[PDB]
C-alpha cells in the first residue's frame, strides 16, 4: 500500500472537522456527567421540603426557585435528567436500529420476507399500544418501569420509520451498483450494511435525533392523562408535565426543565447534522 484509508476513517475525519457538531457532542455528554457529579454537590438535595419557601422565584439559596412543596427546582431537574436522558438515548438508538434492520431486510429482499415482516408491522400498528402504555406504565416505581417503558416505547415506535426505510430501499435496490455488488459475491448483509444503510442514512439520523425528544415527551403525554411516572420518583417528563399548568403564572417551574429539553434536542440535532455531512460526499460545507 502507501496510505490507503477505509471509508469509516474518512467519515470520522470528516465528522470531527465540523466544529458545531464536535462541540455539541462534548456538551451533550458533559451535562450527562454533570447530572450525577452535581447532585452530591449542591446545597439542597432533591425531595428536601422547605415549608418556609413555597413557590419562590429564583434567588440566592434556591438558584432556580422552588416548587409548590418547597423542593429545590435545580436539584429536582438534575435528578429528572438522570432518568430521562438515559431513557431518551436508549429509545432513540433501539427504535432507529430496529426500524433500519426491518425496513432494509424487507425492502431489499421482497418475496415472503417482505410479506411477513410487513404483516407483523401492520399488526403492531393496528393494535392500540396506547392502552398497553397507559396501564403498564403505572405498575412499579424502580428501574423496572424505565426498562418496561423503553421496551414498550421502543417496541411500538419503530413501525412508521420501518415503512419509510422500506420504501426508500425498494428504489435503492434497483440501482446499478447494488447489482454490481451482487455480481461480485458481496453477501446480502455486507450489501445492506455497506451500500443500502449508508445511502439511506440521511433519514436514519433525523429519526434518531427526533426520537430522543419524542421519547422524552411520550412520558409527559402520559402524565397529562394521569398515567406516567409516579410522584415518589421524578423524571424530566414529569417535571414538565407539572410545569405546563403553571407555565404562565409561575414561569420558572416550567421554563427551566423545558429549557433543558430544548438544549438536549438542539445538541442532538447539531451532532446529527455533522454526521450526515460526513456520510455524504457531495456536502458543500466540507469544500475548503
Amino acid at each position: 500500500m502507501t496510505e490507503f484509508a477505509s471509508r469509516r476513517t474518512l467519515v470520522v475525519r470528516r465528522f470531527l472537522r465540523n466544529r458545531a457538531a464536535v462541540a455539541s457532542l462534548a456538551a451533550l455528554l458533559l451535562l450527562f456527567v454533570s447530572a450525577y457529579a452535581l447532585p452530591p454537590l449542591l446545597p439542597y438535595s432533591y425531595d428536601d421540603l422547605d415549608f418556609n419557601a413555597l413557590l419562590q422565584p429564583p434567588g440566592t439559596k434556591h438558584w432556580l426557585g422552588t416548587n409548590a412543596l418547597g423542593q429545590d427546582l435545580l436539584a429536582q431537574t438534575l435528578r429528572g435528567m438522570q432518568k430521562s436522558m438515559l431513557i431518551g438515548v436508549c429509545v432513540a438508538v433501539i427504535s432507529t436500529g430496529i426500524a433500519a434492520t426491518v425496513g432494509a431486510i424487507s425492502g431489499y429482499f421482497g418475496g415472503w420476507r417482505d410479506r411477513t415482516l410487513m404483516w407483523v408491522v401492520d399488526l403492531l400498528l393496528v393494535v392500540p399500544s396506547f392502552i398497553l402504555i397507559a396501564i403498564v406504565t403505572p405498575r412499579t416505581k424502580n428501574s423496572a418501569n424505565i426498562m418496561f417503558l423503553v421496551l414498550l416505547l421502543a417496541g411500538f415506535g419503530w413501525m412508521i420509520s420501518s415503512r419509510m426505510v422500506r420504501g426508500m430501499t425498494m428504489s435503492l435496490r434497483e440501482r446499478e451498483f447494488i447489482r454490481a455488488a451482487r455480481y461480485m459475491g458481496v453477501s446480502s448483509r455486507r450489501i445492506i450494511v455497506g451500500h443500502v444503510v449508508p445511502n439511506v442514512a440521511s433519514i436514519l439520523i433525523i429519526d434518531a435525533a427526533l426520537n430522543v425528544a419524542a421519547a422524552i415527551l411520550a412520558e409527559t403525554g402520559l402524565s397529562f392523562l394521569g398515567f406516567g411516572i409516579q410522584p415518589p420518583d421524578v423524571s424530566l417528563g414529569t417535571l414538565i408535565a407539572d410545569g405546563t399548568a403553571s407555565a404562565t403564572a409561575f414561569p420558572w417551574v416550567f421554563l427551566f426543565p423545558a429549557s433543558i429539553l430544548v438544549l438536549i434536542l438542539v445538541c442532538a440535532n447539531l451532532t446529527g447534522d455533522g454526521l450526515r455531512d460526513a456520510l455524504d460526499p457531495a456536502s458543500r460545507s466540507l469544500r475548503r
Binding site: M1, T2, E3, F4, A5, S6, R7, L10, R14, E174, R175, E176, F177, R179, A180, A181, Y183, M184, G185, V186, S187, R190, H195, P198, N199, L279, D280, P281, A282, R284, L286, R287, R288
Partner: protein, 608 residues
C-alpha cells in the same frame, strides 16, 4: 462579433485537499459556420472548460477568466440572465448520458419541457407532438411507443440520443457537445453527425465538439485543439494537423490510433509514461517527463503557443525537429507481439436460443400495456477458453441485454445458458456464489455501477475483500491495480463523483481486473478513454490473455479495436445474431447486406 470568444479561462476545484487546477489559461473562439474539435488526453480539463463556458460548474469551481457569447461577457451574469441563453443560444450535450436525465420523468416529457421553456405559448399537446418528432429525427426505434419510457428503460445509445435531442430542441446558436457519439454504432452516428451538420448549414450554430476518437474529427470538424494538462497545447486546421503535426505529444497521440487493417494481437503502441499529476506540476512543459526530445531547457519555463505556420500554433520550444519526421521516428520505442500465448478450445460459455422480452405500458398507476420489445430473439453464442468473442451491431439491438442475462446466473426466459460447464439452472445458491469467482464485468455506464459514498480504494478493493484477502494483499493489489490502469496513488481517497469520466471508466476496469477472473465481460470498456490511454488498456488485456488464458466477452461500437482483439465476432441487429464467425471471414467479406453496410460506413481517419 464572434459567436464565441474565450480568453484566459482557468478552473481550480477547491475540494478537501490540494486544489486541482483542471484548466490553466486557455483561449479560443468559434465562428457561426464552423466546427471546432477539442481532442486531448483523459483528465486534461476539456469537460471542465466546457462547463465553465456554459456556466454549470459546482459551487466550489472558482472559475477566473473571460468568456463572451456575442459581445455579452457571460462570466458573472446572474442565473436569470444566464437562463435566457442556456437553452436558446447555448445547447449542451453532457458526457454521461445516464445521470443527465431525471429518473422520474418520461423522456418525451423531458424533451417537451426543454421545448416549452423558451416558447411557453406552444402548450402541451403541440410540445409533446414535436418532442416525438425529435425522437424520430434522431433515430430512436418506435418513437411513439418509446416516448413514455423512463430513462432506465432505454439502451445506452438511445439514452444518449435523448440528450442530443434535448440539446438540439430549440435550434441554438452554439452547440457545446461532449463526445456525442460514444454509445452509438457507426451507421447511426453517421446520421447524428448529419443532423449536427444540418444545424450548421440550415442555420448558423458553430459547434464546439469534444471527442476522444479521431475519425469523427477527420470528417466533421474544421479546426482542432489539442489539450494537455490544462493548457491548449497544439492548434491548427484539421487537415493540416493530421499530416503536419509539430508537437511531440500530438506526434505520439495521432500515431497511436487503431488501424482496422490488423489481425489478432498486433499490440498497438501507446505513449510511454504516466499522465501528469495536475496538482504539483513542476515548472516547464508538462509533457517533459514523457518527451523523447526533452532537453534541460525544456524544464526551466512553460512554453507558450508560438506561430509555426498559417493558422498553426504549437506549445513547444523545439518543433523544427518534429517537422517531417514520423511517430516511428520521433518515438524510437517499438512494440512487438512476442508473448507466452496459450491456445485451447474448451467451451466456457454456450448460450443457445436465448430470448428476452420487455413489456411496454402507459399510465401512472394502472399501467396498461401498449406493446413489447423483443430485446433478444433467439441468439446462439459460443465462447471458447482463451479466446475473445466480439459483439458488434446496431445501437439498441440487445447487446447489453445478453451480457447481463449470462451474468445473472439463473435460468433465462426461454433459453439455455452454460457457463464453465454448469447449466445455470442446475446451480443452487452456494454453488452459484462460488462460481462467480471467475467471471466479472465492466458496465457500459461506469459511473452508475460505482456508488457515490465510497472512496476509490473501497470501490476497487470491494471485490477482493468479499473473497478472502487480508489487508496486506488487498492493499498491495490495489496499489498495483491503480498504476496498471494509469491512475495515481492519492486518488484512493477521492469519491467517484470528482473524476473526469474516462477516469471513472478506468476505476471500473480496475475493479473488474481484481481477482483475475477466467471470463471477463466488457460492455464498451474503452469508450470514454482517449486514443493513447486506451491503447495501453488493449495492450494490457491482450498480454494478460496470452498468459493466464483469459477469455473476454467484448461488445463495443469501435470496429477497429475489435479488429485487434477479437478471434470471432457476432454482428447483432434487432435482437438476432445477423452474422457470426471468425473475424476474417466476416471482416474480409460480409455475406449479409447490413454488416457490409456497417463495415463500409466506418470513418476513415485520413481527411483526404
Amino acid at each position: 462579433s464572434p459567436l464565441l470568444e474565450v480568453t484566459d479561462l482557468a478552473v481550480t476545484f477547491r475540494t478537501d485537499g490540494d486544489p486541482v487546477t483542471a484548466v490553466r489559461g486557455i483561449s479560443y473562439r468559434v465562428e457561426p459556420g464552423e466546427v471546432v474539435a477539442m481532442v486531448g488526453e483523459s483528465g486534461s480539463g476539456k469537460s471542465a472548460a466546457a462547463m465553465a463556458v456554459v456556466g454549470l460548474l459546482p459551487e466550489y469551481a472558482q472559475v477566473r477568466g473571460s468568456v463572451r457569447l456575442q459581445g455579452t461577457e457571460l462570466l458573472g451574469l446572474a442565473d436569470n440572465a444566464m437562463s435566457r441563453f442556456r437553452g436558446k443560444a447555448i445547447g449542451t450535450v453532457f458526457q454521461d448520458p445516464m445521470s443527465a436525465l431525471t429518473p422520474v420523468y418520461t423522456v418525451g416529457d423531458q424533451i417537451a419541457e426543454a421545448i416549452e421553456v423558451h416558447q411557453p405559448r406552444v402548450g402541451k399537446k403541440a410540445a409533446r407532438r414535436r418532442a416525438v418528432e425529435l425522437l424520430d429525427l434522431v433515430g430512436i426505434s418506435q418513437p411513439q411507443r418509446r416516448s413514455r419510457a423512463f430513462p432506465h428503460e432505454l439502451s445506452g445509445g438511445e439514452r444518449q440520443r435523448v440528450v442530443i435531442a434535448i440539446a438540439i430542441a430549440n435550434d441554438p446558436d452554439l452547440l457545446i457537445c461532449d463526445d456525442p457519439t460514444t454509445a452509438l454504432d457507426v451507421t447511426v452516428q453517421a446520421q447524428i453527425l448529419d443532423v449536427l451538420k444540418a444545424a450548421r448549414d440550415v442555420t448558423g450554430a458553430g459547434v464546439l465538439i469534444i471527442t476522444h476518437d479521431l475519425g469523427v474529427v477527420a470528417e466533421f470538424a474544421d479546426r482542432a485543439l489539442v489539450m494537455y494538462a490544462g493548457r491548449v497545447v497544439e492548434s491548427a486546421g484539421v487537415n493540416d494537423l493530421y499530416r503536419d503535426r509539430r508537437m511531440p505529444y500530438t506526434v505520439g497521440l495521432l500515431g497511436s490510433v487503431p488501424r482496422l487493417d490488423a489481425a489478432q494481437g498486433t499490440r498497438l503502441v501507446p505513449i510511454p509514461g504516466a499522465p501528469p499529476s495536475l496538482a504539483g506540476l513542476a515548472p516547464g512543459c508538462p509533457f517533459a517527463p514523457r518527451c523523447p526530445l526533452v532537453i534541460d531547457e525544456c524544464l526551466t519555463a512553460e512554453p507558450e503557443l508560438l506561430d509555426v505556420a498559417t493558422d498553426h500554433r504549437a506549445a513547444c520550444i523545439r518543433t523544427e525537429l518534429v517537422t517531417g519526421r514520423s511517430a516511428a521516428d520521433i518515438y524510437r520505442v517499438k512494440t512487438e507481439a512476442r508473448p507466452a500465448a496459450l491456445g485451447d478450445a474448451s467451451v466456457v460459455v454456450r448460450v443457445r436460443h436465448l430470448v428476452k422480452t420487455y413489456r411496454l405500458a402507459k399510465g401512472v398507476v394502472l399501467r396498461r400495456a401498449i406493446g413489447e420489445v423483443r430485446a433478444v430473439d433467439g441468439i446462439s453464442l459460443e465462447l471458447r477458453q482463451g479466446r475473445t468473442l466480439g459483439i458488434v451491431g446496431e445501437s439498441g439491438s440487445g447487446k447489453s441485454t445478453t451480457l447481463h442475462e449470462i451474468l445473472e446466473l439463473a435460468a433465462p426466459q426461454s433459453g439455455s445458458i452454460e457457463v464453465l460447464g454448469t447449466d445455470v439452472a442446475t446451480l443452487g445458491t452456494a454453488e452459484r456464489r462460488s462460481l462467480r469467482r471467475d467471471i466479472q464485468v465492466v458496465f457500459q455506464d461506469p459511473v452508475a455501477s460505482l456508488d457515490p459514498r465510497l472512496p476509490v480504494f473501497d470501490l476497487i478493493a470491494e471485490p477482493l475483500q468479499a473473497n478472502g484477502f487480508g489487508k496486506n494483499e488487498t492493499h498491495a493489489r490495489v496499489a498495483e491495480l491503480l498504476d496498471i490502469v494509469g491512475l495515481r496513488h492519492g486518488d484512493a481517497s477521492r469519491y467517484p463523483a470528482e473524476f473526469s469520466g474516462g477516469q471513472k471508466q478506468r476505476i471500473g476496469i480496475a475493479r473488474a481486473l481484481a481477482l483475475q477472473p477466467k471470463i471477463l465481460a466488457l460492455d464498451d470498456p474503452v469508450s470514454a478513454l482517449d486514443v493513447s490511454i486506451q491503447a495501453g488498456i488493449i495492450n494490457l488485456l491482450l498480454d494478460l490473455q496470452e498468459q493466464f488464458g483469459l477469455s473476454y466477452l467484448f461488445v463495443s461500437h469501435d470496429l477497429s479495436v475489435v479488429k485487434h482483439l477479437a478471434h470471432q465476432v457476432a454482428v447483432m441487429l434487432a435482437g438476432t445474431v445477423v452474422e457470426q464467425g471468425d473475424s476474417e471471414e466476416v471482416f474480409g467479406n460480409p455475406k449479409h447486406e447490413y454488416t457490409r453496410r456497417l463495415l463500409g460506413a466506418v470513418p476513415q481517419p485520413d481527411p483526404a
